[PDB]
Design an enzyme around this catalytic site. Structure first.
Site, short mmCIF file in Angstrom:
data_model
loop_
_atom_site.label_atom_id
_atom_site.label_comp_id
_atom_site.label_asym_id
_atom_site.label_seq_id
_atom_site.Cartn_x
_atom_site.Cartn_y
_atom_site.Cartn_z
NE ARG A 1 41.16 12.66 40.44
CZ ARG A 1 40.73 13.85 40.86
NH1 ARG A 1 41.36 14.47 41.86
NH2 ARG A 1 39.69 14.44 40.29
CG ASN B 1 48.61 21.86 40.69
OD1 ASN B 1 48.82 21.22 41.73
ND2 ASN B 1 47.49 21.74 40.00
CD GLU B 2 46.90 17.60 39.56
OE1 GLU B 2 46.12 17.72 38.59
OE2 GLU B 2 46.68 16.88 40.56
CD1 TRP C 1 45.98 24.59 39.27
CD2 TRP C 1 47.21 25.35 40.99
NE1 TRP C 1 45.61 23.89 40.42
CE2 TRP C 1 46.35 24.34 41.47
CE3 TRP C 1 48.08 25.99 41.89
CZ2 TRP C 1 46.35 23.94 42.82
CZ3 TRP C 1 48.07 25.60 43.22
CH2 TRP C 1 47.21 24.59 43.67
CD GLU D 1 45.10 19.45 44.46
OE1 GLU D 1 45.93 20.24 43.94
OE2 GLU D 1 44.06 19.08 43.88
O1 LIG Z 1 39.87 17.29 42.05
C1 LIG Z 1 39.93 18.67 41.62
C2 LIG Z 1 41.36 19.24 41.74
O2 LIG Z 1 42.17 18.42 40.87
C3 LIG Z 1 43.57 18.66 40.92
O3 LIG Z 1 44.12 17.94 39.88
C4 LIG Z 1 43.94 20.18 40.81
O4 LIG Z 1 45.27 20.43 41.33
C5 LIG Z 1 42.94 21.11 41.56
O5 LIG Z 1 43.05 22.49 41.11
C6 LIG Z 1 41.49 20.68 41.33
O6 LIG Z 1 41.15 20.82 39.95
#
Ligand SMILES: OC[C@H]1O[C@@H](O)[C@H](O)[C@@H](O)[C@H]1O
Ligand SMILES: *[C@@H]1O[C@H](CO)[C@@H](O[C@@H]2O[C@H](CO)[C@@H](O)[C@H](O)[C@H]2NC(C)=O)[C@H](O)[C@H]1NC(C)=O
Ligand SMILES: *[C@@H]1O[C@H](CO)[C@@H](O[C@@H]2O[C@H](CO)[C@@H](O)[C@H](O)[C@H]2NC(C)=O)[C@H](O)[C@H]1NC(C)=O
Ligand SMILES: *[C@@H]1O[C@H](CO)[C@@H](O[C@@H]2O[C@H](CO)[C@@H](O)[C@H](O)[C@H]2NC(C)=O)[C@H](O)[C@H]1NC(C)=O
Ligand SMILES: *[C@@H]1O[C@H](CO)[C@@H](O)[C@H](O)[C@H]1NC(C)=O
Ligand SMILES: [Ca+2]
Length: 640
Positions: A356, A157-158, A111, A234
């Site tokens: 989400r 990550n993202e 991250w 994820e």
């Molecule tokens: O929904 C919460 C999650 O959201 C994602 O975007 C992220 O990779 C995670 O670390 C956590 O923050």
């Protein structure tokens, strides 16, 4: 009406496994200091085969020293020329998972990154080879120091990927003998990774898996066209209530049905972080009280079992999966060895919303479903049955089903919010340990003198770093302060979140409102250095910059300041003090109702200073910037 299950026209995609994430960030923080036997019990509910969640996949953060959602996680390389493969808790977690399930799949993903990799910028693609060297060190260390084979490595990550970085990472992996390690990209949306793979043959060759986040059960045309394995790398991130469990149930099935996704990985593995940090209680279970031993085997644990106990990576989906006439879905898988597993869910809209994305209404009502086993499935006479009802009855084994009448067919009465697993496999088990101790607040009287000569973990228990990184520290050259806690970052990371400009570690009970915090402090930087202790700290994690409370700062230029905010924009009090660098001072901060006071070496520095009230939050310690400082003999007494 009638749903045909058949392997005669061939099979669907290969199933790759169900997993969960530890990290992004410090989600497993409070698990490490659980007393036995509870710590080991929790690990069993998560990782022991034919027991609880029986996870196929464990994905961990490669700590980068930055704040990554509920805390920072320590890197293996804090500075250039630094290497340490024993910081934090991900190594320990991977090893505990491996001891229970040797066939578990391991993944790593960064991250944040240490700032020195940026060579002047907050950007990990300035020197591709350097960043790849850093990541590959981590993988090699996993093998060399912990006997861990990392199966999958991700990108950032993202955050954006760089195609040349991905190529350099593959080159570097191969060069270090890690040809078996596979690459997943880009841990963000389907695009631009999916189209990039179609336009660039060389990139296509080096990416093994397309991993997308929170896809809402769907994929995109370019990803199907790539022919790559597609994972929801994820997902979930919803409170582990019955509602959370429904969300998990529904997406586990429908990610494959709707999106051709052959793995789903939940953020996060276990909620072992203070619940008032962002996304509190969003793990498959809850273990946020190491001081009491209390943990909760939440619903999603049993939702997981319905798939994980009855499938394994390497099984294949059948071509015959789909939605139910009156709502809900069914998947079916085989192992190529005559076994068959059938997973049915009927999650109502109102009891299965993930955060989400949020789905528009859909109806679910009572229905009957008839299943007929054609092809080689016809030869099956008997099925074990497992049942769960959310709302609540969990992972209850029901009476075996028999299809002796040669029909190769059976029928079910299905209501709403139910899961059925129908499998040939006999190995199912609702694992059970005695109930753990009742929940109790964090101790209202607490102390840590950090006097541990050979600590098992790199940081003292219960201190959750939210910017910067704090570690046990031994200084032989001092007898009065031989064992301390030290903030070790000397520059801002390549951040993922918006880390504070000051370092900070929080501890205790967020409900606390009247409190007295004491700590010995030691400023290492002459002239410019500063440290603080604090109370009523009300926010952390990705919101750490937002934190308010009462902050008592002292500086090596002979000054102090009392602020309402971590950012120091709001002054409660300020003045002069006999404070210099490289000297030990005892700080005391007392907060009660509308009023606070501060002490330096037992002597009043400021008194009856008016603060905002009501207010509540954790105790904390920290440093003015990313700078070295030490802390010793920490004490807090508080009223909740
Ligand atoms: O929904 C919460 C999650 O959201 C994602 O975007 C992220 O990779 C995670 O670390 C956590 O923050
Ligand atoms: C991806 O999965 C989808 C289903 O979500 C497959 O698309 C078709 O699904 C319909 C029913 O929704 C079936 O009648 C078709 O047989 C499916 N298409 C084909 C070509 O068989 C789709 O096949 C999958 N894509 C893959 C495997 O690349
Ligand atoms: C169902 O799955 C089980 C689990 O693997 C299969 O049982 C194994 O079969 C292999 C070879 O077929 C043996 O070497 C193992 O010793 C078996 N293990 C166990 C625990 O039985 C089984 O073959 C599959 N099919 C059926 C009809 O049970
Ligand atoms: C924290 O301290 C404040 C300050 O004394 C407490 O508030 C007072 O409580 C007493 C008795 O409960 C009341 O008579 C006062 O009127 C309160 N003062 C104010 C300004 O509200 C508060 O109860 C304490 N809280 C805890 C949890 O100990
Ligand atoms: C859902 O469907 C059932 C049966 O089809 C119907 O009776 C009910 O009114 C529907 N509910 C909604 C909110 O559409
Ligand atoms: Ca000490």
């Amino acid at each position: 009406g009638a749903y045909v299950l058949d392997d005669s026209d061939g099979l669907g995609r290969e199933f790759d496994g169900i997993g969960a994430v530890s990290g992004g960030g410090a989600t497993s923080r409070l698990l490490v200091n659980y007393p036995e036997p509870y710590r080991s019990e929790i690990l069993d509910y998560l990782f022991k085969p034919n027991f609880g969640a029986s996870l196929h996949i464990l994905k961990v953060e490669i700590g980068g020293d930055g704040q990554t959602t509920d805390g920072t996680e320590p890197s293996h390389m804090h500075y250039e020329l630094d290497e340490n493969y024993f910081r934090g808790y991900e190594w320990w977690l991977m090893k505990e998972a491996k001891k229970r399930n040797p066939d578990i799949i391991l993944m790593g993903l960064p991250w944040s990154f240490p700032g020195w990799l940026g060579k002047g910028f907050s950007w990990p693609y300035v020197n591709l080879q350097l960043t790849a060297y850093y990541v590959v060190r981590w993988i090699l260390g996993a093998k060399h120091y912990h006997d861990l084979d990392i199966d999958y490595i991700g990108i950032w990550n993202e955050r954006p990927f760089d195609a040349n970085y991905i190529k350099e990472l593959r080159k570097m992996l191969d060069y270090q003998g890690l040809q078996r390690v596979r690459i997943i990209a880009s841990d963000n949306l389907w695009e631009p990774i999916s189209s990039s793979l179609l336009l660039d043959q060389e990139l296509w060759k080096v990416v093994d898996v397309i991993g997308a986040h929170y896809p809402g059960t769907y994929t995109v045309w370019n990803a199907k066209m790539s022919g790559k394995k597609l994972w929801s790398s994820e997902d979930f991130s919803t409170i582990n209530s019955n509602v959370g469990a429904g969300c998990w149930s529904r997406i586990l099935n429908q990610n494959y049905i709707n999106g051709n996704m052959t793995s789903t990985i939940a953020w996060n593995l276990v909620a072992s972080y203070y619940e008032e940090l962002p996304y509190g209680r969003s793990g498959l279970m809850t273990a946020q009280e190491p001081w009491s031993g209390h943990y909760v085997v939440a619903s999603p644990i049993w939702v997981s079992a319905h798939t994980t106990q009855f499938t394994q990576p390497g099984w294949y989906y059948l071509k015959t999966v789909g939605h139910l006439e009156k709502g809900g879905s069914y998947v079916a898988l085989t192992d190529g060895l005559g076994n068959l597993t059938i997973i049915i869910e009927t999650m109502s809209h109102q009891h299965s919303m993930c955060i989400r994305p949020y789905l528009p209404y859909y109806n679910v009502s009572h229905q009957l479903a008839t299943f007929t086993l054609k092809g080689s499935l016809r030869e099956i006479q008997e099925l074990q049955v497992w049942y769960t009802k959310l709302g609540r009855l969990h992972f209850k084994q029901l009476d075996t089903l028999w299809l002796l009448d040669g029909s190769g067919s059976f029928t079910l009465e299905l209501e709403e919010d139910e899961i059925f697993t129908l499998t040939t496999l006999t190995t199912g088990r609702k694992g059970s340990y005695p109930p753990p101790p009742s929940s109790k607040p964090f101790p209202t009287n607490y102390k840590d003198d950090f006097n541990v000569e050979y600590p098992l973990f790199s940081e003292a228990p219960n201190f959750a770093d939210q910017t910067g990184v704090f570690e046990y520290y031994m200084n032989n050259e001092d007898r009065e302060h031989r064992f301390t806690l030290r903030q070790v970052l000397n520059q801002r990371p390549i951040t993922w979140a918006a880390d504070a400009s000051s370092t900070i570690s929080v501890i205790g009970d967020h409900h606390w409102t009247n409190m007295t915090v004491q700590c010995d402090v030691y400023i290492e930087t002459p002239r410019s250095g500063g440290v603080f202790i604090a109370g009523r700290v009300n926010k952390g994690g990705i919101l750490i910059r937002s934190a308010t409370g009462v902050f008592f700062w002292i500086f090596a230029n002979g000054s102090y300041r009392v602020t309402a905010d971590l950012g120091g924009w709001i002054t409660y009090a300020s003045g002069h003090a006999d404070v210099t660098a490289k000297r030990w001072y005892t700080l005391t901060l007392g907060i009660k109702g509308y009023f606070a006071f501060g002490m330096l070496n037992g002597t009043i520095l400021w008194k009856n200073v008016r603060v905002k009230y009501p207010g509540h939050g954790w105790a904390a310690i920290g440093t003015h910037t990313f700078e070295f400082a030490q802390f010793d003999n920490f004490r807090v007494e508080a009223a909740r």
